[PDB]
Amino acid sequence: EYRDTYWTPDYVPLDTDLLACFKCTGQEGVPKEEVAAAVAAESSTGTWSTVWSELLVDLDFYKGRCYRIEDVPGDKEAFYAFIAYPLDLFEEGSVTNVLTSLVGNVFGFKALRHLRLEDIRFPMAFIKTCPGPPNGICVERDRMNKYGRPLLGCTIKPKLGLSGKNYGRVVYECLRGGLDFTKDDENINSQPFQRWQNRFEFVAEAVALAQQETGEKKGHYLNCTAATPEEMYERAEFAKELGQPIIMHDYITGGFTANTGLSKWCRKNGMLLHIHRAMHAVIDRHPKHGIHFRVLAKCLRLSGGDQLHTGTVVGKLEGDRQTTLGFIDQLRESFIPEDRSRGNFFDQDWGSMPGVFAVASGGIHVWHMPALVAIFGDDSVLQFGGGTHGHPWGSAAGAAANRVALEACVKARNAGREIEKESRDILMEAAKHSPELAIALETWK
Amino acid sequence: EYRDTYWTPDYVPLDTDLLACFKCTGQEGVPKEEVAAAVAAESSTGTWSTVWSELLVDLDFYKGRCYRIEDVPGDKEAFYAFIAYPLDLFEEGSVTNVLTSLVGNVFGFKALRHLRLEDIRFPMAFIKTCPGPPNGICVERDRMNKYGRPLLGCTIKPKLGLSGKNYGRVVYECLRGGLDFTKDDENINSQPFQRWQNRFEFVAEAVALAQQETGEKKGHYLNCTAATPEEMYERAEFAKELGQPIIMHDYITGGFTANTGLSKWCRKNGMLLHIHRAMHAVIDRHPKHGIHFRVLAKCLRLSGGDQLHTGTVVGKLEGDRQTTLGFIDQLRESFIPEDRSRGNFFDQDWGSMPGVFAVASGGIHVWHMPALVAIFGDDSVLQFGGGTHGHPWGSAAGAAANRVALEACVKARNAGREIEKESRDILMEAAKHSPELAIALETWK
Amino acid sequence: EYRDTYWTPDYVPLDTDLLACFKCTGQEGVPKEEVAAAVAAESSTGTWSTVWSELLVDLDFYKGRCYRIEDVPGDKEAFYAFIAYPLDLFEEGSVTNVLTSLVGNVFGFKALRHLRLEDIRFPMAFIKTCPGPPNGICVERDRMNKYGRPLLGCTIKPKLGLSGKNYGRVVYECLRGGLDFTKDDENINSQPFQRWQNRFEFVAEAVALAQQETGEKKGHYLNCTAATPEEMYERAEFAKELGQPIIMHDYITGGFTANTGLSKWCRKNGMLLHIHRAMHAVIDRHPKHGIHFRVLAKCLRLSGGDQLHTGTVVGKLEGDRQTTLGFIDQLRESFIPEDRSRGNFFDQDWGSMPGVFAVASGGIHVWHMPALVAIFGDDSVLQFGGGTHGHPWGSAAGAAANRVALEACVKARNAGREIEKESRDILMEAAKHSPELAIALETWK
Amino acid sequence: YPLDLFEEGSVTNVLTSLVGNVFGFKALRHLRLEDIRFPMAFIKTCPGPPNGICVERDRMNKYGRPLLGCTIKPKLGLSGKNYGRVVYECLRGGLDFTKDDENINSQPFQRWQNRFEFVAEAVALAQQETGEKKGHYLNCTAATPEEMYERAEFAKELGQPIIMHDYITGGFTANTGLSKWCRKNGML
Amino acid sequence: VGDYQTVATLETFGFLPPMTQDEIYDQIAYIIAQGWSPLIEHVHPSRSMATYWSYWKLPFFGEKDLGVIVSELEACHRAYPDHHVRLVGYDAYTQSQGACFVVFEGR
Structure with a gap:
């Protein structure tokens, strides 16, 4: 039993602590508090019996604290667990150290059927220590x-x-x-x-x-x-x-x-600095286990970088664009209020540390652009590899068609218009001066 | 449909190709050949419509070939797929390039419910290109x-x-x-x-x-x-x-x-060079999706290194030590014959490129050592953090007890004895000259 | 008038702000709030008339806030002023930038008869950014x-x-x-x-x-x-x-x-790294104007260093050892509670950033040592240039006498004895085995 | 060979100037380089053995x-x-x-x-x-x-x-x- | 209760009491069963930290008899009864020492 020293029923996190959210599923019929405390300890401290050297350093101060277990909306076996971390448990500006201390060994404990890292609340101090994006x-x-x-x-x-x-x-x-x-x-x-x-x-x-x-x-x-x-x-x-x-x-x-x-x-x-998210799906494809892409996005933003791939969400899967827009908020804004629907479990402030551009690519072409503009705002980049190249008039003509489509869409958005519904009229009006856009919209109607 | 150009019913891989095994689960009621060909293409080539620039380079030669679909023993929806890769698709000695070309974007395709990289057959040429372990x-x-x-x-x-x-x-x-x-x-x-x-x-x-x-x-x-x-x-x-x-x-x-x-x-x-496998579980904890640890072990051995953490398998989970011993074989031997039980789907030869030591640590102490010696052979290292330190007589006494236990166990093994059964007699005989070993064996009986 | 935008009657400082205390004396018959706001602005912003470029950046967020004017205990014309600073106004770990932004131009304003920087409350973030002492x-x-x-x-x-x-x-x-x-x-x-x-x-x-x-x-x-x-x-x-x-x-x-x-x-x-405070008196000799030595000590501790000269206070001037012990606390302890008598106007915490040794030298010899041990604790160094060298038996004998005096004094202190009163008995007992100590105590009775 | 036809201490240049192209002429059934008399100047130019x-x-x-x-x-x-x-x-x-x-x-x-x-x-x-x-x-x-x-x-x-x-x-x-x-x- | 004093030990069975002759027979029989080759090393105990010890007669390849190994061990022990004497099994296919331990410790 580890709850007695690693489960805190009434502790309030300090503003310099590192707060982590884990969606945890222990074995059937196990104490949720006990498994949460086991995860928290396995992040910091673990012994199989009575030990001696831990009496030479104050284990009380250098230990994590799981302070809140909340019921996941959709599964009563899976539960959200919020674990605190004293600031001293990490390096001054090492995202690598954060990942090692957070998921280094916790995923190997047999007493957990599944474990998923959901959200991280980085303290302002640790954010100020890291180099951050070089430009912004x-x-x-x-x-x-x-x-x-x-x-x-x-x-x-x-x-x-x-x-x-x-x-x-x-x-x-x-x-x-x-x-x-x-x-x-x-x-x-x-x-x-x-x-x-x-x-x-x-x-x-x-x-x-x-x-x-x-x-x-x-x-x-x-x-x-x-x-x-x-x-x-x-x-x-x-x-x-x-x-x-x-x-x-x-x-x-x-x-x-x-x-x-x-x-x-x-x-x-x-x-x-441009960045692609190769092998991110191997960490976030499974919706119940692994690490959510918002954590990886936070880590990349702390480690520095100007662009990060996301998809949009749309084009193939209408999905749950709420949480996608949530991590977009975490990518752009200096502060983000809590939003359970968007998957934001902490009041996270970045001070005045510049954000990162969002990259939307894969399975998209001219027909999707209005919705992409609506969801991603103006601080994003759109990539159409096959769409621009597969245009029958050539890559230059396809790129020009996508450019004029984007210009018309952002003009209509600035006009105060709801782009998503009348998107067909917008693209027809754009095609009234760009035959390449017309043939492209014809290709993938 | 991509089977016509990315599924090969009768192709035989060339000895210079890179062979990859994927445990694939497409959507329900989809052609297994089609989803395998989709995975193979998504590793090399992907277009949403007719394209032009692909006629300036011979796509026929620079493309992967999935040549064998086998039924997984245990699931009829999951199937093993063997995909070939021409040698030119990678860098001369870049494991990073191999990972980018293998799992860079394949995990994001919606037409696959789950995808798991199982085995890789590295050609002798690519192995000779990489620096390999510095010492051996x-x-x-x-x-x-x-x-x-x-x-x-x-x-x-x-x-x-x-x-x-x-x-x-x-x-x-x-x-x-x-x-x-x-x-x-x-x-x-x-x-x-x-x-x-x-x-x-x-x-x-x-x-x-x-x-x-x-x-x-x-x-x-x-x-x-x-x-x-x-x-x-x-x-x-x-x-x-x-x-x-x-x-x-x-x-x-x-x-x-x-x-x-x-x-x-x-x-x-x-x-x-010593290496630890921090965050490996986030890639291999899930038994149905992700990347198997044998692939990561192969990649590390190619990239260089003298030691690699494994656990044993035993101490907490009797598990399936067969595949563990399989990746141990892939870590030590220059050549390994095919073994479906050990998870070795290819006849892999390393030439005369030196192997890597195995590291067994975590949840182990004196009581497990005979089985550890039996399974890991002589080319391994055993770590007991808490066990040696948590010994009541001190870290030095615990280390001495583990050392003499290992000496007695390897002596009995060299004597021609079956250590696993009579292990209790072996440890008692060792304790007949090491009271610290006796009290340690008493602590965690 | 600058109070309307640079005097805050009810603002509470943020935990990431930089808090500064100034003992201010404006001209006779001037508003204390107005002169405090003038000092606060002169630290950040100053214009002689209506300006344009300040409307392109939010002056509201990038400006200091004087939030508390307190009456100095001893002068009703001099008053303590507490000015806040947003974290973004400085460099990540540049004490030089802190000094430039704090005293760069404020001391040149004619509307202030005298200005003295008293205390600084460095935020935990800025402390974590600076390199700090190399060893501790x-x-x-x-x-x-x-x-x-x-x-x-x-x-x-x-x-x-x-x-x-x-x-x-x-x-x-x-x-x-x-x-x-x-x-x-x-x-x-x-x-x-x-x-x-x-x-x-x-x-x-x-x-x-x-x-x-x-x-x-x-x-x-x-x-x-x-x-x-x-x-x-x-x-x-x-x-x-x-x-x-x-x-x-x-x-x-x-x-x-x-x-x-x-x-x-x-x-x-x-x-x-050893450090001496040469030219510090030119900044702190005047008790009413300049910069107090506690601020310089804080700046040196942030900038790095293992030792810092202080005197004790005693030997020539009984003085006000309270504030001296206060800056000693700020030099050694990780956290220090507020103490108006010790000149500590803020609840300052250094996290787990190691402290700096105190150096006591100048106008001291064997006779003062018990009081020096009592006031400076065990984390200090004592230097006797003339005393050890001016000893008639030679520098080695003088150093040995001071060493044995220190040993006897710390022994008696560890014995639970009040060293200050019975110091004469302590030194006589020490001299009962060190004739060089006896002659030294004879020299400067 | 006039001294100027070579580099100051380059045996490589000597070999290039001596056997670079002479062995390819059809008017010679066989050709064999037997002896070379290096001038004292060229010997003094070359670094020579490091120790001796x-x-x-x-x-x-x-x-x-x-x-x-x-x-x-x-x-x-x-x-x-x-x-x-x-x-x-x-x-x-x-x-x-x-x-x-x-x-x-x-x-x-x-x-x-x-x-x-x-x-x-x-x-x-x-x-x-x-x-x-x-x-x-x-x-x-x-x-x-x-x-x-x-x-x-x-x-x-x-x-x-x-x-x-x-x-x-x-x-x-x-x-x-x-x-x-x-x-x-x-x-x- | 009680301390474990540091002991100048001798590399894998330096801790255990000196091996009996039957145990030496079993060890050399194991070396034979692994296809390795016996090799005798003796050196003064003061130079235990060296990399190469003074080798006895050349390693015996194709030798599958225990008695000759024991005779060579006792002969080399009588040659330098004050040196540390160990027996090593050499593997030709891996260019490593398959097994090695001390047989006789010097005075």
């Missing part, structure tokens, strides 16, 4: 001089096979159509068919040419995720020398340590 | 001059709170009892109560003192997982200057890139 | 293996004129008498009569010889304050190579930036 | 007799510990040196760092036991000059007084660079 939302907008509308990206299709020249010319064709950015594929950094130096050189040349032609500050997302941190820094500095204003990375596969180092280097060198 | 099993044994028996470690309890002097003296007390190594806690790298420099200095002094006293080459696992790769390399080089022969790291939290860089640095500087 | 009290005790008693130093007299060999042999003579440390003179770093390299080499040799002879870990304070930071780092690294465990610096003359850099280097290299 | 015969004898304190080496058999297959103990057994018998095999620099069965460490330990032990300054030939011929210099400096740090190289396979440029590094670092 408003700073990125200033560096790109783009406002009024969300930004427009696209993944370079096919997933691989392109040489440096071919990849560069495809990126140029996508970019010259008014598209804001292009992202390299998450699994493509350096290949036998394509060495990264050639791709970076050709894509920098293409970006410069498109920037000169269209009269707009443009850029492409360059990937630095690689085998070693030395190679990552080398590629990042090579991109810096080539005048490219943004680079991209995979923080889960590369690592939280690598992501933090890359963000610090970007701040030290004045570079924008 | 036999090389570590040579550098420590320890043979005959498995090695004995222990985690320093409590999880935190110790100053440099206190941590160093606790490590010295644990080490002087014949214990082989000690591992720092996975979530403890640098803390406000303990700066890493002081811990490294004091633990190096304690290791030197214990090595002089006991007349054996000893060492402690030093952690270099930190916020930035620069700090990691700085701490590793500081440990190198202090004559410490081994350092430790968390490869999942720190990152595959960071782990590969650390292993390359260890090889370049002649250092041993 | 307990860590220094561990690295020196000295406990039970306060430590004993001495300044090397005369103030200058010594060559490398002569300085080294004088330091050796002082050290071999049981003296803990010796401090170089604050104005002596590199001279035409003595180049710093020779002094460091000879003093390192002497420290090594004395350490071998006396069988105790000893050291001397080496000064790195110089013309350029490059020279400072060079001398610090030279001392590191020579095995010297502590270096000293003048943080006011050298600068807060230089002190912070030196402390960071000491933490990165595992070095102890 | 008498200097090596001084650094080893061995005179009177020729020196005695042996190749470590078998050609390969040894681990770091096994290679080191075999070298120690060969060295402790009064043998002057041992040479690694010309085709063995870094192998999947044996990484060069382990071999260098173990052989340095064995050389130190044998030197202490026999009371003579001894050493083993360490190979630095590798894929890249950076790796060659890294291994040479690692051997220098381990107190090994001699390293070995294959000048034809590694290259005349690599050999010249290695010799210059040995002179700059006092290595045989």
Whole structure:
């Protein structure tokens, strides 16, 4: 029994503590308080019998406190548990240390059928310790001089096979159509068919040419995720020398340590950082067990970064857009009030620490854009890899069609109109001056 | 429909291909071939309609091939799928690239209820490209001059709170009892109560003192997982200057890139590398979805490393030790024949690339040791954090008791005896010369 | 008039704000609220007429708030003013930025006859951001293996004129008498009569010889304050190579930036940092105007450092030891309750950030030691430059006499005795085994 | 050949200018380079051997007799510990040196760092036991000059007084660079 | 109750009392059963921290008799009755020491 020292019936968390929410399912017919206290201890302290060395350090002060067990709305065996953590249990600005101390060993205890990390309330102190995003939302907008509308990206299709020249010319064709950015594929950094130096050189040349032609500050997302941190820094500095204003990375596969180092280097060198969520589903695909994507989003925002992939939710699955908009709030706003429907179990304030852009990509094209604008607001980016490329008139025409669709949609939204219902009229009116938009809307009606 | 170009009814994999096994569960009443082909394509290629740029590169050659669907023994909705990959789809020695290309986006497709990566057959070429473990099993044994028996470690309890002097003296007390190594806690790298420099200095002094006293080459696992790769390399080089022969790291939290860089640095500087599997359960706790721990073990062995945590399986859960011994085989042997019971779906050969030590820790003490020796063989390490420390006579006495228990057990095993049954007689005979062993066996009978 | 927007009659400070106390004396017959609001604005915002650019940033949020005016006990024209500061007005761990934002321009306003900074309540977040002392009290005790008693130093007299060999042999003579440390003179770093390299080499040799002879870990304070930071780092690294465990610096003359850099280097290299308060009196000699020494002590503790000079208060001036003990509390304890008599106007908590040793030197010798032990506790160091050197039997004999006096005094204190009254009996009993102590007590009765 | 037709101390340039294209002319059934008379100037330009015969004898304190080496058999297959103990057994018998095999620099069965460490330990032990300054030939011929210099400096740090190289396979440029590094670092 | 004094032990069966001759027979029989090769090492106890001990006659490959091993052990023990003498089983296929422990401890 561990409730007596790790379950607190009347404790109130301190404003400097780290508060964690776990959706817990113990074995059948077990005390919920006991399993919650077991989880809390397994996060900090665990012994199989009487021990000696724990009397040389005050275990009372350096221990977690589960202070509230609430009944989950939908399952009476699953319950939300709120565990506190003294500030001293972590490193000053190490998201890696937070993950190690939170999920390092708790998932291995046999007395828990399922465990899911739901929400984390980071104290203001720990947030002020971490480097945070190198640029921020408003700073990125200033560096790109783009406002009024969300930004427009696209993944370079096919997933691989392109040489440096071919990849560069495809990126140029996508970019010259008014598209804001292009992202390299998450699994493509350096290949036998394509060495990264050639791709970076050709894509920098293409970006410069498109920037000169269209009269707009443009850029492409360059990937630095690689085998070693030395190679990552080398590629990042090579991109810096080539005048490219943004680079991209995979923080889960590369690592939280690598992501933090890359963000610090970007701040030290004045570079924008794009991030993709590769392998996030392996942690959040299961709706009952694992780690919710909001926790990963919080960790990435603390570790630094300017963009984070989300999908929207819509296009294939109407789903539960409430919690998606909730993590969007946690991505953009400095403070977010509690919202059980949005999956926000704590009053979380970020002080004046700049937020992170949201990335919506995958299974989307022109027909979805009004709802995407409505749900994601103006602080987001939309990527249409196949849609822009699969347009019969070419990638440039597809990008132009999506750009004018976005312009018309944001104009109608600024007009004070409910875009979701009359979206068909909006797209028809836009097509009255863009035949490529008309044929695109015809393709995927 | 994607079967026509991504399902191969009669294709035989090439010996240079990368073969992957997925336990797949599509939606109810869907073609198993179609969902397998969808997974295979989503690993390499995906388009929502007719596309143009894919005619500039031969999609036929740069595409995966799912070539075999087998019925899972236990579920008729779940099925094993074997997907091939041309060698060119990856980087020459980047486990990060392998993970990005394998699980980067496949887990997000709505047409799959569940997906689990089971087994990977790495081609000999890709294995020869990767740096691999810096030292190897036999090389570590040579550098420590320890043979005959498995090695004995222990985690320093409590999880935190110790100053440099206190941590160093606790490590010295644990080490002087014949214990082989000690591992720092996975979530403890640098803390406000303990700066890493002081811990490294004091633990190096304690290791030197214990090595002089006991007349054996000893060492402690030093952690270099930190916020930035620069700090990691700085701490590793500081440990190198202090004559410490081994350092430790968390490869999942720190990152595959960071782990590969650390292993390359260890090889370049002649250092041993210890690794803990923090956050592995978040990927393998669910038995039906996620990534099996054998895949992560393969990835770590390719990325380099000398030790990997496993538990045993026993102590709390008798479980299915067959597959555990299977991944042990994949950790130690150069070649492993196929074994469906052990979860080995491919004839995997590592050439002459040295293996990795297995680490068994957590929920174990003196009573379990005979079975641990029987299942893990001689190429493993046993850690008893609480058991050695919680011994009433002190950490040194507990470590000595575990050491003599291991010596007696390996002696009886070398004698040709079945240790599992007569284990009680073995431990009584050992206690006939070690009263600390007797009281320990009394404590947790 | 600025009260309307910079005087808050009912505002309660936020727990993340920076709270400052100013003893203010405006011109005769002026509104106290108005002058307090003028000081608060002059710390953040000041305009001579209507302005435009302040409407592009929310001045409401980025402005200080004076929230309490209290009547000073002793003057009705002087009044204590408590001004709040939003956390965002400073740098993450820059004491230099704090000083610039607090006293950068406020002291130049004509509407204030006198202004004195009394107390600062640093938020927990800002404290967690700063590097802090590199080692700490307990860590220094561990690295020196000295406990039970306060430590004993001495300044090397005369103030200058010594060559490398002569300085080294004088330091050796002082050290071999049981003296803990010796401090170089604050104005002596590199001279035409003595180049710093020779002094460091000879003093390192002497420290090594004395350490071998006396069988105790000893050291001397080496000064790195110089013309350029490059020279400072060079001398610090030279001392590191020579095995010297502590270096000293003048943080006011050298600068807060230089002190912070030196402390960071000491933490990165595992070095102890001694600090002297040269030119502090020019800021705190005047009891009605300037900056109180408690503020400077807080700033140094935040900026890092292991020792700080204080005097005691006694020896020449019985004075007001209450506030001295107050700043001692602020130097040692993690938390200090409010005490108006001790000059502590805020409930200040340092979390678990290690404190700083107190240094008592100047105008003291053997006769004062019991009271010094009583007032300074065990976490302090005592320096007797002239007293140990001016002893007729030599520096070694004087140091031994002071050492045995300290041992007897701390023994009697541990015995449960009131040392201050029976101090004469204590010193006579000590002299019953130390004739050098007897003659010293005879010299300055 | 006029002196100006070559580089000041480049044997590589000499070989390029001497046999670069002459062997391809059809009007010659056979051609064989027999002897070369190097001018004193060109010899004075080249770095030359880093130590020399008498200097090596001084650094080893061995005179009177020729020196005695042996190749470590078998050609390969040894681990770091096994290679080191075999070298120690060969060295402790009064043998002057041992040479690694010309085709063995870094192998999947044996990484060069382990071999260098173990052989340095064995050389130190044998030197202490026999009371003579001894050493083993360490190979630095590798894929890249950076790796060659890294291994040479690692051997220098381990107190090994001699390293070995294959000048034809590694290259005349690599050999010249290695010799210059040995002179700059006092290595045989 | 009571303390455990630090003891200069001898590497895997340095803690247990010295092995009996029948136990030596069993150990060498196990070494034979694993396909390893016996090898005898003796060294002065002052140099126990060295990496390579003074080896006896070359390792016996293809030798499957216990009696010759025992005779060699007693002969080497009589050669240096003050040195530490241990027996090591060498595995050719893995280039490691399959099993090793001390047989005779010096005076």
